Nucleic acid binder design. Structure first.
Ligand SMILES: [Mg+2]
Ligand SMILES: [Mg+2]
Ligand SMILES: [Mg+2]
Ligand SMILES: [Mg+2]
Ligand SMILES: [Mg+2]
Ligand SMILES: [Mg+2]
Ligand SMILES: [Zn+2]
Ligand SMILES: [Zn+2]
Lengths: 491, 491, 491, 491
RNA sequence: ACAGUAUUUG
RNA sequence: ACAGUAUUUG
RNA sequence: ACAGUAUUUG
RNA sequence: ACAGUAUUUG
C-alpha cells in the first residue's frame, strides 16, 4: 500500500552481536536496504597503498600491481595517470613505485582493479585530487554558484554530493579543506618509504553509513547498544553533519531492535532463492556464471491483469532485492508474458522508477521480443552470495546431480576403455556406494563380460562410503606394478 | 578444421547395453547429435489417447484432460477443433470424450500440452488429418508439382518431409496411403469404447531415428548388435526407405563401437558444465529457472582477434551442445566482448549458420547493448538435465550453501524471537552439528543471555549428525506441553 | 605405605551436581568405598509392597508376585512364612494377597527376589518382625546383656548392629521402639486396601549412608553443599546418632571437594578395565556371563619376590575394586604363579584380611592347583557395570568382531546354500560395505560360479553403509514373488 | 542319540575355495573336529631355524632368540640342551648360534617359545634326536617288543604314535629311517651358514591331517576337488599309510560337500557365543584375559533331573567346542547347580569321558564348592578367536560402553579440574556428539558456572561425529599459546 | 514438420 | 606325542 | 559520486 | 545384618 513519505524513514543500527554489525535503512517497516559488516572479513574497497608493478602484460592493455596481498592487483592502462606517466609497454616502466587505490575488490579469481586515479569522499564532497578533468554534481539534484567560489587547486577536479544540497558554501570550503589536508598526508605519507605497503584504510560500516547513506528524510537513528552510540555520536562530530546529534537515539526495548521494527523476515527474504510477491506470486533469483537471472511467476477475474499486475510487484521487489543482495553485473529478468505493449512499457518504467534510489548506477533496456528484459548494475561491493555462501560441494556449482544409473553406465564404459589400454593389469574404479552396488548387480554380467575378453585384466570395483554420488575414480594399474591388496583396502 | 562433406557421416547404433540404447549421428569422428532411449523412462511425446475433460478453467484459456495418467493434461482453447466444436466455457462442454494427442511432455509440474490437432508422420509425409488449413514443405528444400497430384481427402492438410526430396510421386501416394489407413483405425479404434485410455504409441528410438534423422549424406548405419540389426533391417522395410538395406552394416570390432569411432569423450562433453573450445577457451552452460544461460570465455598476438576468434568457436560449440543436451526454451549467450560491430554481426551469423541443422526451430536476435545474445529454441523432447539428473539435494537447486556463521547467527535470532513468543516453555533448535557447535561455543554467552531474560525459557540446542549444513529446525514448546527428555534424545 | 589409623577417615559428600549425588568414604586420601545415587534410576532394594501371586510354577520351587511393576517378582517357597501359611501348590493358594519385600533387585531378566520375611533396620538394630527364629549380633563385635533386657514381642527376632557397640541399652529400647512403631503402620497400612501396590520406600543415599556406613573412626563428614548439609543435619537427628552433629562440616574451598581430597582419579579407576598396582603391575577385571574374572600381572633383583609381592598388591587392590564396583556373585582371581606354598597361603590371607571391611558377605577358597582362587561375594546392590554401562552394540557382548574375510566366506556359503533351496528366484544378501566389496571382487568368480549352476537364480548382493561389520541379512525370494527393483534400493 | 561306532567316521576335505581350505572330521553327520588352513596366515608352529640370542634376561630364567622375524623368540633355560651347553648367564654365552624350533606360536605380545629340543614326527614315530631321555608310547594304547628292536642311535630318544598300533616293526625302521635321514640334513643344513634364518617348514594342513588325525575308524576321505585329491594321493604315498589310497574318494555331488554332509551350521556353531544344548539349554562361551569361561543354563517333570541332565549335555558340547575353537589355557565351567554329589561326580566323569579324544592334553579338577569346575588344556595351535576375530573397536575389549551421562558428568569434571590447572587459557574437550549435546544442554549451567569462577578460562566443548560414544579428548591450552580458531574447526 | 512453426501458458 | 606331558613364563 | 559513470577486462 | 548369612534359583 506503500507511498514514500507516509511513515518515518529510520536508520536501525544493531550492535548487540559481536560477530556481525548490521545497519538497515527502513521507511516505516519496509526494509529498503541493509548492510552487514563483520570483523575480519572487513571492507577493502576504497583503500590506498603504494605500488610497484609485478608484470606488464599487454595482451590485456594493462599491468598488474603489487600492493602486497596475495594476488597482485589489476591495473588498466585506462586507470594510469599524467604523473605516473614518464599503448602499454612504453607507458609503464616496470617495477615502478605508484600510488594506487582499489576500485573493485578481489573476486574469486581476479586481483582487484586498482586505479592510480585516487578518489576521496567527504560528507558533501568528493576529491579527484588527480584529475581536474572530471567534476560535477549529484546527478540527483545556488551551489553550482557556490561551487565555482570553491578555492580549488588545479591538479584535480571534484564533485558535490547529493547531500550537500541542504548545506552552505562556507562549509564545502570546510569539507574541501579537510580532504586535501588528508590528500596531502596521503601524498607525503608515500614520499616516505619503499611503497610495497598500505597507506589509508577505508573506514568501517557505520561511518560509511553516516557518510554515504544519510539524508534529510532520515528521521531517527536508533542504535541499540550504548557503547556504539558512543562512537556513534563522535562519528557525526567529525564526518560533520551535526544537525543529527539531535537525530540519533538509543534503543532500549527488551524485544530485539530489528525484531521490533518487524523487519527480521525481510532480512532473510534476501538469502532465499524464491521470494513472495505481494499478490502471492514469486520471484526466483537464480545466479549463473554469466549473469544473475531473475524469473517471475504468478499466483493461483482476468488474465491480462493477473500478469500485468504481478509483473509490477515483481518490478518493485526485484529492485529491492537487487539492493539487499548487492547483486552486480548483468541481470536478466523474465517478466511474465503480457500481450499489450503499453503494459510492457508500463512495467519497464515501473522498474526504472523503482530503482531510482539504488546508490549504484543502473541501466535498463526495453523488454525483448523473447520477453526478457536485460539490465546492468554497478558493482558497489561484494554481493551477499559472494560473501556469505559457498558451493554446494556435492554439485560443483550447478545444483543437479547425475542420476545413479547414467553415472554407472558411464563409470562403466570408462572402465572398459581403460581395460583395453594396452599394457594394463588391474584397473580399479572407486565409486560412491550405490554406484558400486549398481555396477556389481544390475550390471555384473557386463563387468564380467569384460575381464573375459580383456583376457586377464582384473577390473576391481570397490564401493566406498566416503564418496558422494557424482564423484569417483577409475585408476589403472600397469603390468608389474600391482599390489596384492584387498578390494576394500583400496583407498 | 572441419568442412561438411569431407568425411563420411554415419549413424552409429549401440545396442550392446540393455539399460540404454544409444544412437549418435557422426560426420567423420565429430559427434554431431545423439540420442539415448532407455526402457521404462521411454518416449511419451506423439502418443494418442481418448479424452474427457477434468476441469475447464478459463483463467488460462483452456481445459485440462484425462487421458489417464497421473496429471491430467493441458489443453489450450487454441488446440481445440472444428469437430470437438459443438471463449472457453461455451466451447468445451465438460466431461466430453475427445481424441487428444501429446505435443509436449510432462515437465516437473505441468501435465502436457495435448492437442486435438492430431499430426501424423511417415518417412516423406506428415498428415494433418484434421485441418486442411495447414500444409506445406520442408522449409528446407517438381513435387510442388507431385503434391497437388496428391489424392488428398479434404478434412485435413499435409506437409512433405525434407527427405521426400529424393523421391517419387508414385510413393507419396504410397506414404499418404499407409497414413490414412492408420488414421482410419486411429479413428474407429476410438469409436469403440469409453475413451479414458491410450490409442497409439509413438515408436521406439531406432525407428524414430530411421524415420526422423536419416538423409542422403548418411553413409553407413553401423549397428553393433546382431539381433537389433535384425529388427534394424525389418524397420526400414516398413518405414520404407529401402535404398538403405544396402546402407546398414554390422559392427564386429572388439573395441567398443562408439569407443572406436573415438566419440566417447564427446558423449560426456554434454553432461559437463564447462566444455572446452578448440582454441582453449571454455563454455560454461549454467541452467536457471527462467532460461538456460551459456557463458563464454578465453584462453591464456592480438586482443581483438583472441576474442573474436574464440567467440566463433563458442558459436560452433554452443550449437552442438544445444543439440546434444536437447536444451529447449530461451537461452542467453554471453559472448566475450569485442568492439567492432562487424564482429558482432560476424559471430551472430556464425551462430545462425551453425544451427542450420538443428531439427528444432531456432530464433536468434542480434547481440544486445549489454553484449548478451538471446535466442529461443523449440522443445523437441525432454532435455538431458531434465531426464538424467536431479537436484543437488544438499542445495535445493542453487549450488551455494550459506556460510556456517551467517546461518548460525540466523538460527540464533530465530531462537531468540521464538523465545519471546508469549507462552513458550522450552524451545528446541535442532541443527547441523557445526551449527550446534558454533552456537554453543563462539556464541554461548548470547544463548545464555536469552534464558536469563526470557526468564525460565529453556532454549535447548541439540547438535545432530543427520542434518547437513543448510537444513535445521527450531520448534517451540508451549507451557505445560513439555516432556522431560534428553537433549540428545530430541529427534 | 598405608596403615589403618594413620590419617583421618572421613565421609565426603558431593551434592554440587543435580544428576548425581556421590558419597565416598575416605581414609586420608585413599578412596576406600564410594556410592553414586542419582535421581530416577533410584534405589529399589529394601522396599515393601502388598502382593498377590501371578503364577505358582513348581518347576522351580516358588511362586511369582505382582507387587506391580513390569516383571512380577520372584518368591521362593523358602521365603514364605508362618502367616502366609494357610511343597509349592499346597502352600501358596494363588491370587493371595501378601506383604512382600525386596531382597535382591531387577537383574536384566529376573524379577527380583521378594521375601515375605520383612527385615527392618535402625541405626543400631534390625527387626525381623516376622521370625523370632533368627536374631544375633554384628558378627563384627555387655549388650549380650542389654539385649536380653530388650522388651521384645515374640512373633519376630532381632539383631544388633556393629555400631550399637558404642551405645547404651536405654536407647536400643529407643530404637526397637521406633521400629515396631513403624512395623505397626507398616502392617495396618496394608490392612487397608487391595494390595497391588507399594507400602514403604527405602530412604535415599545419604540417610542410608548415615545409617549403614558410619562408625567411630569417621572423623568429619564434609558435605559440600549448604542446602543438603541442611537435610544432612536433620537426618542424623532422626536416624539418631546425634553425637555427629559435631561431626558434620560444610566444605567451601573453591577447588572441588573430591578433587581436593585428591580422590578423583580413584573414582574412575573403578570404571577402567585395567587398574595399576602400586609396584607397577596391573589388574585387568573382565566380566563374563558366568562369573566376574580378575587377572593379575607384573611389571618390567628377584623372580620369586616380584611375583609374590605383586600378588599382595593385587590382593589389596582387588578388594577395593570389588567394593567400588559393587561386583557381586562369583569371582575368579588368576594370581601370578609363585612356587612356594607359604606364598600361596600368604596371599590368600592377605586377600582375606583385606576384605575384612566389605559390608557384604565374602567367601574365599584356597588357591587351586591351576592357580586360580575362586571367591563368592554378596550382591549388596546392582554393580557399577550393570547400572552405568551397556553392551558395545557393535559386538553383542563379547568384544571381538569376526575378521572381514572369514565373515565373507561365511555370508557367501550361506548365499550358495540358500540358492539351492528348491523354488527360489532371487536371493539377496545385504551386508556391511566391505563385506559387499570383498564378495564382489576378491570373490566374484565364486558368486558367479553360483548363478551359473543354480540356473537362473539371481544372487543380488547389495553393499550398505548402515550395517557394521558383523551384522547382515541373507533374504531369499520365492518364485513369482520378485519385485524388479534396484540393487541399491533393496533395503 | 549318538553312540560311537554307529555311523561311518569320515574326513571331509573342502578344496573348492582358494582363500580357505577346510578339513572336518565327521562321524556320521556330527562334526567332531575341524581345521581351517588359509594361505598367508599359514601355520608356523613346528618349524626350525638357526638361532643367535638377542638378550639373556635372567629375571625370567631364559634368553630370547633371533630366528629372524619381528619379535625374537622366547627361550627358557629349561628348553636348553647338552649341546648348546658349553642358572642363566653362565649357561648361554650371548650371540651364540643355535638350532632352535618353535613349541608355541606368536601370541599377541609374546615371541614364541622356541626350544633347542627339536622334535620330529612321522606317521607312526616321533624323533627326539636330541634327548635319549624322553621316549614312550601313545599313552593311548607286541611293539613294546618291536620298539626295543628299534635300531636307535643314542643321542636322542623316541615315541611311537597311537597309530603305529596297527602296524609292523619292519616299517618303524622304515619310519625311524626317513626321519633321521631328514634329521641329518636338518643338521648339516645348519653346518652351512650364518644361522639367522629358517631351516625346515612344517607341512600344510592336509598332510598334517593325513598325518596327525587319521585312524582305523576313518572310513572314506572324500575330497571335493580333483586337483587336490591329486596331491591328496601323492601325500599318502610319502607319509606312507598307503592302505588309504583305497580310502580316498572324489566328491562330485552338485550340492556343496560340507553342505551335503549337513555339517554347515555346526561349522558356525563354533563362532557363536551361545550354543544350543540338545535338550534346549545353552552354552555361553565368554573369553576373558585370565581364562576362557563357559557358563551353562537351562531350558523352559522334575528339577533335580532338568539340571543334572542339562549338565550332561553341556558336558558333551563343551568338549566339542573346546576342540572346534582350539580354545587353550584354563577354562572355568559354571555347571548348573545340582544338590546330590553323585551328580557332580557324574557330570565330572561325563566331561572326562567326553574329552577322551582331544589330541591336546587336558586336566580336570573336581567341581568346586562354588560349583565351578576348572580345567586346563593344551595349546595345540592358535585359537579360533585369536586368529579370526579382533576387538570390537568401539569397546576396547570388554563389551560394555559407559552410559552417556555418567561419561558426560565425567568428561565434565575433567574439564573443571583442567580449568583450575594454574596457567591455562582455553581448554577444549572434544567429545562424541551426544556427549557434547548433553554437556551443553542438560548440563550447560555447570559449564558456565566454571568459566565464571575460573575467571577468563574459556572452556570450549566441540561436538564431533567422528568419535564414538566412549572416546574423547580434553586438551588444555596454556596462556599465550591460543589460536583464535572456530569451535568446530577444532580437530 | 507446413504462412500461426517456435517461445509462452497448467 | 613319551614318567617332566600340560598349565604358567616374554 | 561527476559529459567517460556503469557493464566488460586478470 | 544374625547358627540357614552368602552363592545359586525366574
Ligand atoms: Mg563473461
Ligand atoms: Mg546454478
Ligand atoms: Mg517464466
Ligand atoms: Mg549360571
Ligand atoms: Mg567379555
Ligand atoms: Mg596371568
Ligand atoms: Zn548442490
Ligand atoms: Zn564391542
Amino acid at each position: 500500500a506503500h507511498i514514500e513519505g507516509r511513515h518515518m524513514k529510520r536508520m536501525l543500527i544493531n550492535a548487540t552481536q559481536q560477530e556481525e554489525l548490521r545497519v538497515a535503512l527502513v521507511d516505516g517497516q519496509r526494509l529498503y536496504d541493509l548492510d552487514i559488516e563483520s570483523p575480519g572479513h572487513e571492507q577493502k574497497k576504497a583503500n590506498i597503498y603504494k605500488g610497484k608493478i609485478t608484470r606488464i602484460e599487454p595482451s590485456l592493455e594493462a599491468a598488474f600491481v603489487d600492493y602486497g596481498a596475495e594476488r597482485h592487483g589489476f591495473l588498466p592502462l585506462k586507470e594510469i595517470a599524467r604523473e605516473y606517466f614518464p599503448n602499454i609497454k612504453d607507458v609503464l616502466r616496470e617495477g615502478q613505485e605508484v600510488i594506487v587505490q582499489i576500485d573493485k575488490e578481489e573476486r574469486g579469481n581476479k586481483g582487484a582493479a586498482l586505479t592510480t586515479f585516487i578518489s576521496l569522499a567527504g560528507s558533501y564532497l568528493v576529491l579527484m585530487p588527480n584529475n581536474p578533468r572530471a567534476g560535477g554534481i549529484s546527478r540527483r539534484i545556488e551551489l553550482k554558484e557556490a561551487l565555482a567560489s570553491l578555492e580549488l587547486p588545479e591538479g584535480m577536479g571534484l564533485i558535490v554530493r547529493t547531500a550537500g544540497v541542504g548545506k552552505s558554501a562556507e562549509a564545502l570550503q570546510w569539507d574541501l579543506s579537510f580532504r586535501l589536508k588528508h590528500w596531502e598526508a596521503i601524498k607525503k605519507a608515500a614520499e616516505s618509504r619503499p611503497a610495497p605497503f598500505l597507506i589509508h584504510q577505508e573506514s568501517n560500516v557505520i561511518v560509511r553509513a553516516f557518510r554515504d547513506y544519510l539524508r534529510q528524510d532520515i528521521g531517527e537513528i536508533l542504535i541499540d547498544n550504548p557503547k556504539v552510540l558512543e562512537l556513534a555520536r563522535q562519528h557525526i562530530a567529525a564526518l560533520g553533519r551535526p544537525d543529527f546529534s539531535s537525530k540519533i537515539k538509543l534503543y532500549t526495548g527488551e524485544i530485539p531492535l530489528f525484531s521490533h521494527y518487524q523487519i527480521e523476515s525481510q532480512i532473510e527474504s534476501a538469502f532465499q532463492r524464491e521470494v513472495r510477491l505481494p499478490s502471492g506470486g514469486s520471484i526466483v533469483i537464480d545466479s549463473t556464471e554469466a549473469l544473475t537471472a531473475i524469473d517471475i511467476n504468478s499466483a493461483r477475474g482476468d488474465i491480462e491483469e493477473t500478469a500485468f499486475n504481478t509483473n509490477l510487484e515483481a518490478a518493485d521487489e526485484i529492485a529491492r532485492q537487487l539492493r539487499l543482495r548487492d547483486l552486480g553485473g548483468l541481470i536478466v529478468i523474465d517478466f511474465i508474458d503480457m500481450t499489450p505493449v503499453r503494459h510492457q512499457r508500463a512495467v519497464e518504467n515501473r522498474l526504472r522508477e523503482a530503482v531510482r534510489q539504488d546508490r549504484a548506477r543502473i541501466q535498463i533496456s526495453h523488454i525483448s521480443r523473447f520477453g526478457l528484459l536485460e539490465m546492468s548494475r554497478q558493482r558497489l561491493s561484494p554481493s551477499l552470495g559472494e560473501s556469505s555462501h559457498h558451493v554446494c560441494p556435492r554439485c560443483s556449482g550447478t545444483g543437479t546431480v547425475r542420476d545413479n544409473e547414467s553415472l554407472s553406465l558411464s563409470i562403466l564404459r570408462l572402465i572398459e576403455e581403460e581395460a583395453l589400454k594396452e599394457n594394463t593389469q588391474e584397473v580399479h574404479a572407486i565409486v560412491p556406494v550405490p554406484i558400486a552396488s549398481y555396477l556389481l548387480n544390475e550390471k555384473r554380467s557386463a563387468v564380467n563380460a569384460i575381464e573375459t575378453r580383456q583376457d586377464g585384466v582384473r577390473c576391481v570395483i570397490v564401493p566406498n562410503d566416503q564418496m558422494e554420488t557424482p564423484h569417483y575414480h577409475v585408476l589403472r594399474v600397469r603390468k608389474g606394478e600391482e599390489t596384492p591388496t584387498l578390494s576394500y583396502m583400496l583407498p
